[PDB]
Amino acid sequence: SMEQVAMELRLTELTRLLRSVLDQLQDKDPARIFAQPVSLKEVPDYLDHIKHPMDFATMRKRLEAQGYKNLHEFEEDFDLIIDNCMKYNARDTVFYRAAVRLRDQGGVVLRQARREVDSIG
């Protein structure tokens, strides 16, 4: 139908905007600490601690399949990256500290993303 096409164009445009959001958030991780899944070869107990791992490569795969229906779903995954790290790693670690900085700097980007999503519809 024409409605299904219009809905698909809306999803495509959300995907475009989320891709720009993702790039901007990933720039706030210049050490690439969150770029890839935590390796289960190198951290064999990880899944005992963290039940829903996440990382920027995994979000990008989802994004490119148009698998985010709305900004809330995308933000859920970003928050998993931060929150998983802040539980697994102690406060005094470069990993924890990177997640705090990513959260703080990402807030600004996400605040405007929400306005754009609402504004453009």
How would the blueprint of this fold be written?
Elements: H1 2-27, H2 46-49, H3 56-64, H4 71-88, H5 94-120
Terminal Cα span = 21 Å
State the helical fraction: 55-70%
CATH homologous superfamily grouping: Bromodomain-like
What fold name goes in the CATH topology slot? Answer: Histone Acetyltransferase, Chain A
Just name the CATH architecture.
Up-down Bundle
- Rounded radius of gyration (Å): 16 Å
CATH C-level label: Mainly Alpha
**Care to count the β-strands?**
0
**Strand coverage percent:** under 5%
Backbone structural class: mainly alpha
Number of H/I helices: 5
**Molecular shape:** globular
Q: How many structural domains?
A: 1
**Biggest β-sheet description:** none
Order of helices and strands: HHHHH
Domain Bromo: 9-113
Subcellular location: Nucleus; Chromosome
Protein name: Bromodomain-containing protein 1
Cross-link (Glycyl lysine isopeptide (Lys-Gly) (interchain with G-Cter in SUMO2)): 41
TL;DR?
The PDB classes it as gene regulation. The chain is an all-alpha fold.
What does this structure look like?
The chain contains five helices and no strands. It has one domain: Bromodomain-like (Histone Acetyltransferase, Chain A, Up-down Bundle). The chain starts with a helix and ends with a helix. α1 (2-27) runs antiparallel to α3 (56-64), α1 (2-27) packs antiparallel against α5 (94-120) and α4 runs antiparallel to α5 (94-120). The protein is mostly helical. Residues 9-113 form the Bromo domain. This is Bromodomain-containing protein 1.
